[PDB]
Design an enzyme around this catalytic site. Structure first.
Site: not given
Ligand SMILES: O=C(Nc1c(Cl)cncc1Cl)c1ccc(OC(F)F)c(OCC2CC2)c1
Ligand SMILES: [Mg+2]
Ligand SMILES: [Zn+2]
Length: 327
Positions: A78, A288
């Site tokens: 991030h 996912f």
């Protein structure tokens, strides 16, 4: 007055700015860790956003560098590379044929600006971590979309630094609309909003309408699409060439394991996927993809059919690769 050789090679890579699978990590190296600044500058020039909204160039660069400087270099996923990627991915999504001439300039700006700020000042740990530790951020935002609320606040706050207000020349009406849209988009990047977002996207596909481009009557329908667009960009890693996807997986798993290690240290329960000792990197990616990424991108593919087929094909190919990797 001549470009450096490093700058020329950068300018060359940047010629792929309208393409899915831009070498975004190379742009990070070539730009001296300024991928977010250079990709935003290109996109803004490409889309003529400086003239349209009368943004002085130096103010835009100053804001960009400042924004990029509030992404943390010590966070594996991030960070400014992720931000740059979501911006560029959103930029490609916006140019899709099925959306030609649909959105206003101000809307385009909202979608791009929101992508740029959407994870700014991410600490590399989840909302739940922040809540369970009684962090100040959790206290400030009442445990509700803590990070996402923080990302927005920092993103707008940074406009007030020296020669950073890139919206100085917009009317109050323009600014109020921009703002609402940007808040709506970024708050919709919280994964706890994922199911609602997808449900609404499906409802839009079932009630879909064209003139040969998409029709969107009301704020609700227009912002919904933009929210899903940026959320698709945020969940676009597995739809990129495997070389890129694999690098993103390393980085997210690094970040997760770090949170996991900090969680173990402190005797906390270890959040899903964050135990390096009991991980299944390949199985998890498959999960996912089947449960989150594929249902979303399939629904997106339908909304813009056939435009997203190659993206969906790659997602499906990358899913078989990770599947075949399972011990
Ligand atoms: O969480 C994600 N994104 C994210 C978003 Cl879109 C919004 N809010 C929080 C997060 Cl962590 C995200 C992004 C990338 C991932 O893997 C690969 F693509 F690198 C991933 O893997 C799941 C992991 C358990 C198997 C998860
Ligand atoms: Mg986020
Ligand atoms: Zn993100």
């Amino acid at each position: 007055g001549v470009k450096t050789e490093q700058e020329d090679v950068l300018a060359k890579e940047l010629e792929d700015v309208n393409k899915w699978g831009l070498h975004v990590f190379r742009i990070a190296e070539l730009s001296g860790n300024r991928p977010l600044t250079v990709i935003m500058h290109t996109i803004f020039q490409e889309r003529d956003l400086l003239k349209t909204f009368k943004i002085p160039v130096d103010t835009l660069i100053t804001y960009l560098m400042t924004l990029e400087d509030h992404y943390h270099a010590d966070v594996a996923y991030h960070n400014n590379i992720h931000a740059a990627d979501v911006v560029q991915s959103t930029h490609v999504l916006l140019s899709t044929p099925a959306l030609e001439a649909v959105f206003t300039d101000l809307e385009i700006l909202a979608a791009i600006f929101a992508s740029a700020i959407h994870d700014v000042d991410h600490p590399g740990v989840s909302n739940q971590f922040l809540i369970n530790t009684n962090s100040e951020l959790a206290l400030m935002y009442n445990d509700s979309s803590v990070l996402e609320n923080h990302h927005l606040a920092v993103g707008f706050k940074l406009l007030q630094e020296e020669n950073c207000d890139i919206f100085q020349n917009l009317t109050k009406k323009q600014r109020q609309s921009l703002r609402k849209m940007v808040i709506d988009i970024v708050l919709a990047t919280d994964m706890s909003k994922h199911m609602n977002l997808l449900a609404d996207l499906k409802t839009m596909v079932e009630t879909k309408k064209v003139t040969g481009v998409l029709l969107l009557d009301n704020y609700s329908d227009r912002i919904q699409v933009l929210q899903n667009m940026v959320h698709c960009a945020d969940l676009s890693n597995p739809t990129k060439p495997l070389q890129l996807y694999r690098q993103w997986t390393d980085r997210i798993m690094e970040e997760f394991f770090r949170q996991g290690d900090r969680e173990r240290e402190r005797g906390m329960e270890i959040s899903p996927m964050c135990d390096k000792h009991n991980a299944s990197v390949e199985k998890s990616q498959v999960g996912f993809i089947d449960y989150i990424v594929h249902p979303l991108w399939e629904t997106w593919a339908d909304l813009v059919h056939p435009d997203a087929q190659d993206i969906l094909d790659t997602l499906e190919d990358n899913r078989e690769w990770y599947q075949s990797t399972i011990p």
